[PDB]
Amino acid sequence: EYPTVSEIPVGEVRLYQIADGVWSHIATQSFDGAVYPSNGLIVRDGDELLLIDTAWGAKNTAALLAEIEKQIGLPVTRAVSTHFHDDRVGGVDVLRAAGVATYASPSTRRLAEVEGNEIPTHSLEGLSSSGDAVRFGPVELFYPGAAHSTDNLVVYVPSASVLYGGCAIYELSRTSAGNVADADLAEWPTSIERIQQHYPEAQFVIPGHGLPGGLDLLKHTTNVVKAHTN
Ligand SMILES: O=c1cc(CP(=O)(O)O)c2c(F)cc(F)cc2o1
Numbered sequence: 574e575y576p577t578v579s580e581i582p583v584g585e586v587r588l589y590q591i592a593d594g595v596w597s598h599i600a601t602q603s604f605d606g607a608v609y610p611s612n613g614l615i616v617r618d619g620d621e622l623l624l625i626d627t628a629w630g631a632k633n634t635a636a637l638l639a640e641i642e643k644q645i646g647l648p649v650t651r652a653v654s655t656h657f658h659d660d661r662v663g664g665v666d667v668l669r670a671a672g673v674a675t676y677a678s679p680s681t682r683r684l685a686e687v688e689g690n691e692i693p694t695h696s697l698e699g700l701s702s703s704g705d706a707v708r709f710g711p712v713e714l715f716y717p718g719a720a721h722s723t724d725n726l727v728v729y730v731p732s733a734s735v736l737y738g739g740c741a742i743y744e745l746s747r748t749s750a751g752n753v754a755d756a757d758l759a760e761w762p763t764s765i766e767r768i769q770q771h772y773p774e775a776q777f778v779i780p781g782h783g784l785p786g787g788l789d790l791l792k793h794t795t796n797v798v799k800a801h802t803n
């Protein structure tokens with residue numbers, strides 16, 4: 574019942590209710606003749622919504638906003654990008670044009686600027702050191718340390734026991750690392766262990782791409798990263 578690539582054309586977005594007041598958004602993007610799905614998160618905050626990550630591009634992100642307005646009907650007042658790559662910040666300009674306040678760590682903002690990517694407007698404080706956590710509306714933001722990228726953040730929704738790992742956490746069906754050009758392979762398993770230590774009660778774990786599961790997605794990602802290292 575989780576949407577797959579065969580069921581979403583590039584340009585369209587699906588929403589999937591994970592728990593009360595928590596959704597993932599699913600879009601697709603083409604790259605080198607392959608089509609990949611990509612996840613982000615939506616968290617209700619009273620009568621408004623917190624968005625986690627763009628839908629990987631301007632067109633997808635415009636469709637994401639339209640699908641949120643149609644299905645949920647609450648305003649997206651803030652958005653957090655969890656690292657500087659295009660599947661997390663691609664579409665920030667669309668969000669900003671729609672009146673969404675876009676946020677990222679100062680680390681992410683700097684890496685986005687170096688990359689020539691779109692740059693979230695606001696800077697998130699309190700996330701500079703591995704193990705740092707801050708409350709942000711209905712979620713906790715956690716910097717586990719370098720993994721998929723040096724700046725990657727994860728997001729926890731305490732009310733729903735939902736852990737969003739972003740691209741630092743792989744789905745079970747992904748058995749090879751793939752693209753790790755900006756990764757810290759040496760630190761990635763240590764950063765995953767910080768996530769496991771901080772969120773042992775998580776019931777749902779959402780990877781950056783593909784199917785949700787439980788906490789065994791953390792050990793899975795460590796296994797894949799260590800195999801790639803060797
Ligand atoms: O599932 C993915 C998703 C992405 C984006 P990211 O690496 O930031 O998650 C991706 C990519 F951009 C290039 C590639 F060659 C493979 C990829 O595989």
Ligand SMILES: [Zn+2]
Pocket residue numbers: 656658721722740
């Ligand atoms: Zn990335």
Ligand SMILES: [Zn+2]
Pocket residue numbers: 660740781782
């Ligand atoms: Zn990704």
Ligand SMILES: [Zn+2]
Pocket residue numbers: 745792793794796
């Ligand atoms: Zn595995």
